């Protein structure tokens, strides 16, 4: 089955129990907040080994509903993007 954030909390807490469990979740949800905020402010998120996690742009377009098929105008906007770093790349490549 899949791992979740709720399961990360406990597994980190087992492999780093010497830190307070709640200092751990505190840390971990603040650091997710930090990276998401960095994206929301239009910034890189670059690291080594892991990879880099970044932003991309979409131009305005006339899309419209898969259900109803009714014209919908859309303005230009940004979206997150992620490229895996060659260390993680090869770790996940069986």
């Amino acid at each position: 089955g899949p791992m979740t954030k709720s399961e990360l909390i406990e597994r980190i807490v087992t492999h780093q129990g010497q830190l307070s469990a709640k200092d751990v979740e505190l840390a971990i949800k603040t650091m997710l907040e930090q990276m998401s905020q960095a994206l929301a402010t239009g910034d890189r998120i670059e690291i080594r080994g892991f990879g880099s996690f970044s932003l991309h742009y979409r131009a305005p377009r006339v899309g419209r509903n898969p259900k109803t098929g009714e014209s919908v105008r859309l303005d230009g906007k940004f979206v997150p993007h992620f490229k895996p770093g060659k260390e993680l790349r090869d770790r996940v490549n069986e």
Binding site: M35, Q37, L88, R91
Partner: protein
């Protein structure tokens, strides 16, 4: 860029946890995420986009600067799907393309 050194700094500043152990905390969270995907254990996140692994099929490739064609072998690679909460947070900012 945002750097996990800057996360260690932010964690010291905002939580008060010493940067020495804060750096190990972030790097362990960053290592166990890798352990999950390395095991093909799909990592699943809310309030945030999440981590899938996609089994890409054979595709045509190229040398873009010569026009030569090279096949792209089928492979399993990690693909991260941003969530709507993250997209809504990220949709608009500044005034330049990225």
């Amino acid at each position: 860029a945002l750097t996990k050194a800057e996360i260690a700094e932010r964690l010291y500043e905002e939580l008060g946890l010493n940067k020495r152990e804060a750096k190990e905390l972030v790097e362990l969270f960053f290592e166990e995420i890798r352990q999950a995907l390395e095991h093909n254990e799909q990592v699943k996140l809310s309030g945030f986009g999440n981590f899938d692994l996609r089994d890409k099929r054979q595709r045509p490739g190229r040398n873009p600067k010569t026009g030569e064609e090279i096949p792209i072998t089928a492979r399993r690679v990690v693909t991260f799907r941003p969530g709507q909460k993250l997209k809504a947070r990220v949709e608009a900012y500044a005034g330049t393309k990225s």
